[PDB]
Design a binder for these strands. Structure first.
Ligand SMILES: [Mg+2]
Ligand SMILES: [Mg+2]
Ligand SMILES: [Mg+2]
Ligand SMILES: [Mg+2]
Ligand SMILES: [Mg+2]
Ligand SMILES: [Mg+2]
Ligand SMILES: [Mg+2]
Ligand SMILES: [Mg+2]
Ligand SMILES: [Mg+2]
Ligand SMILES: [Mg+2]
Ligand SMILES: [Mg+2]
Ligand SMILES: [Mg+2]
Ligand SMILES: [Mg+2]
Ligand SMILES: [Mg+2]
Ligand SMILES: [Mg+2]
Ligand SMILES: [Mg+2]
Ligand SMILES: [Mg+2]
Ligand SMILES: [Mg+2]
Ligand SMILES: [Mg+2]
Ligand SMILES: [Mg+2]
Ligand SMILES: [Mg+2]
Ligand SMILES: [Mg+2]
Ligand SMILES: [Mg+2]
Ligand SMILES: [Mg+2]
Ligand SMILES: [Mg+2]
Ligand SMILES: [Mg+2]
Ligand SMILES: [Mg+2]
Ligand SMILES: [Mg+2]
Ligand SMILES: [Mg+2]
Ligand SMILES: [Mg+2]
Ligand SMILES: [Mg+2]
Ligand SMILES: [Mg+2]
Ligand SMILES: [Mg+2]
Ligand SMILES: [Mg+2]
Ligand SMILES: [Mg+2]
Lengths: 116, 70, 87, 101
RNA sequence: GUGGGAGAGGGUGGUGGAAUUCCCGGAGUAGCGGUGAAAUGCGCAGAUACCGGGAGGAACGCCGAUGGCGAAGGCAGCCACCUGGUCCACCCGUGACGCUGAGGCGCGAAAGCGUGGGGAGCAAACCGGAUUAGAUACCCGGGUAGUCCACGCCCUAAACGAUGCGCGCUAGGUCUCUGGGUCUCCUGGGGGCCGAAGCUAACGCGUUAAGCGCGCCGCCUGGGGAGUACGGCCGCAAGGC
């Protein structure tokens, strides 16, 4: 009940999960998914397979809204940070472009002990 | 691969206003380029940096960019 | 700070004869000028420590050139001293 | 009196009564702080690398000056207090160090 | 003295972007987070992810080096002002004015103390979840002092080159920062690496001496007891000498 044509697809990957949100060309989301959205629970959520299925599920869910051309944004690193873009490619969405936007500070904030 | 200064005129390292040139020492992203790729001497690079950062605060050069393909 | 105008005006003030740059007199003049600048700079800025050390040093020098001068000619020393407002 | 270079980047969108206004106000500042004006370069409309004040562009000014030192700071404060002036950068002049000589 | 130079040397004021947290708004479902696995925790009062807007604190990515400055502690966004040290060239000026330095005085990371601000992230103590034979720990989720600033104390340290300062003398080679030159190269001045002679118990040091000498200061004299006790002095205290 939108019929959105072309759109943006963000992939946020971590060591604990991947999630994909899909969104409109001015930035508002449409559907999303994640390893926990589809079956998985524990650590199991940040496997690359789960990354795949999240990618897919979100992309079929985008077919339902009538998505065709998609521009990709990627943020973070985890297993199947890549596998999500692999699935997202052969998903039946024509991929406009991939981009890596991962946010990094110009060194402002103390990290947690696990991070130094 | 070419080092920047190898292909270039005889140009102010001290001009923060000239973007055409200063752009050439930025990377694909906003990152200032290593000496390896700017073919610059020690002092030279040191001046270049400061002129870039100036220009950046002037909105002429990008503080950071986004990476394409990936 | 101290520019060439000021600097010179002082050296031509304290020279033993025309042309003299490094007389004991002139060194203590120039010294004493710099000293005064700096102790004014630390009238504010009491948190500038490194400059302060510099001044302890400058002072040390002045005091040595005086100690000498007085050993050599006492008279020209008394001169230098009243002229500068010191000790 | 030392030699500086004042960069001014102000809102692009101005029309004429407006643009001439802010420019004369900059002027009244430089007169008031004792700034002799050796040259001016008005570059104007330019594409910024990053948005400044929500705006993708900027209007560009460059002024070589000789002014007394202890003022340059205050002069910059007053130059900034204007709303339409989005950046002020004053810089002590330098000689042109070259490269690939 | 003159004339050049390099620099995160100090102090003061301004200012820029990235990021975190938070709040307002949009769009959007059912999870997010987290770990070896988990659970506490957060989420239907709408979270995470995404977009736009605001606020606030702290720290400065690339440049960045095996680099630089500083007496040491230590010092990194940009700008301006105030200021210290130092290097080279010129060979101009004084004419031994030098070196060291018990005491004194000043500086002195971090933590800590006092009075008043500030508070994003982090985080002793503490509160929970786990793990384990037990867990008072590591691992996870919270969180206060603190970290930040102003002023005044504290005076410790693997405050390390574990190498006191100054000067003269004794092969080179190689990389480098920064000056000057008639600029394959020379010649000052810093940073490294190999290595002559020599030194050293060895390891190693070797024109940045741990070599050959001279000056002056500090210090040592088996281990434990013990940086304890008593005494003094300093300190608000902690505690220091
Ligand atoms: Mg997980
Ligand atoms: Mg303004
Ligand atoms: Mg500095
Ligand atoms: Mg400073
Ligand atoms: Mg909301
Ligand atoms: Mg609930
Ligand atoms: Mg609940
Ligand atoms: Mg707040
Ligand atoms: Mg680095
Ligand atoms: Mg200086
Ligand atoms: Mg002579
Ligand atoms: Mg003579
Ligand atoms: Mg002593
Ligand atoms: Mg201290
Ligand atoms: Mg402290
Ligand atoms: Mg306190
Ligand atoms: Mg925390
Ligand atoms: Mg337990
Ligand atoms: Mg904790
Ligand atoms: Mg000795
Ligand atoms: Mg040369
Ligand atoms: Mg040094
Ligand atoms: Mg050398
Ligand atoms: Mg060497
Ligand atoms: Mg031998
Ligand atoms: Mg050796
Ligand atoms: Mg020696
Ligand atoms: Mg020995
Ligand atoms: Mg002892
Ligand atoms: Mg004994
Ligand atoms: Mg003790
Ligand atoms: Mg006794
Ligand atoms: Mg006692
Ligand atoms: Mg007492
Ligand atoms: Mg103790």
């Amino acid at each position: 009940k939108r019929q959105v044509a072309s759109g943006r697809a963000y992939i946020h990957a971590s060591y604990n999960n991947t999630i994909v949100t899909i969104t409109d060309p001015d930035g508002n989301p449409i559907t999303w998914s994640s390893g926990g959205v589809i079956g998985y629970k524990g650590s199991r959520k940040g496997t690359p397979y789960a990354a795949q299925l999240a990618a897919l599920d979100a992309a079929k869910k985008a077919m339902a809204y009538g998505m065709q051309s998609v521009d990709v944004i990627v943020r973070g690193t985890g297993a199947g940070r890549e596998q999500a873009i692999r699935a997202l490619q052969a998903s039946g969405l024509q991929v406009k472009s991939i981009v890596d936007d991962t946010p990094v500070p110009h060194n402002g904030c103390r990290p947690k002990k696990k991070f130094r | 691969k070419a080092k920047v200064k190898a292909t270039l005129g005889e140009f102010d390292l001290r001009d923060y206003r000239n973007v055409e040139v200063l752009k050439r020492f930025l990377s694909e992203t906003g990152k200032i380029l290593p000496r390896r790729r700017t073919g610059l001497s020690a002092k030279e690079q040191r001046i270049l940096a400061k002129t870039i950062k100036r220009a950046r605060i002037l909105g002429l050069l990008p503080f950071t960019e986004k990476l394409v393909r990936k | 700070p101290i520019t060439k105008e000021e600097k010179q005006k002082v050296i031509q003030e304290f020279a033993r004869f025309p042309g003299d740059t490094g007389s004991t007199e002139v060194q203590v003049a120039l010294l004493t000028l710099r000293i005064n600048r700096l102790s004014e700079h630390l009238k504010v800025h009491k948190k500038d420590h490194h400059s302060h050390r510099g001044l302890l040093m400058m002072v040390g020098q002045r005091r040595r050139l005086l100690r000498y001068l007085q050993r050599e000619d006492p008279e020209r020393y008394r001169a230098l001293i009243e002229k500068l407002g010191i000790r | 009196m030392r030699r500086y270079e004042v960069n001014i980047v102000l809102n692009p969108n101005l029309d004429q009564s407006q643009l001439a206004l802010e420019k004369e106000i900059i002027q009244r500042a430089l007169e008031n702080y004792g700034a002799r004006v050796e040259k001016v370069e008005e570059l104007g409309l330019r594409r910024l690398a990053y948005p400044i004040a929500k705006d993708p562009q900027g209007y560009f000014l460059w002024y070589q000056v000789e002014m007394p030192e202890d003022r340059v700071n205050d002069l910059a404060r007053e130059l900034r207090i204007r709303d339409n002036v989005r950046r002020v950068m004053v810089v002590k002049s330098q000689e042109p160090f070259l490269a690939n000589a």
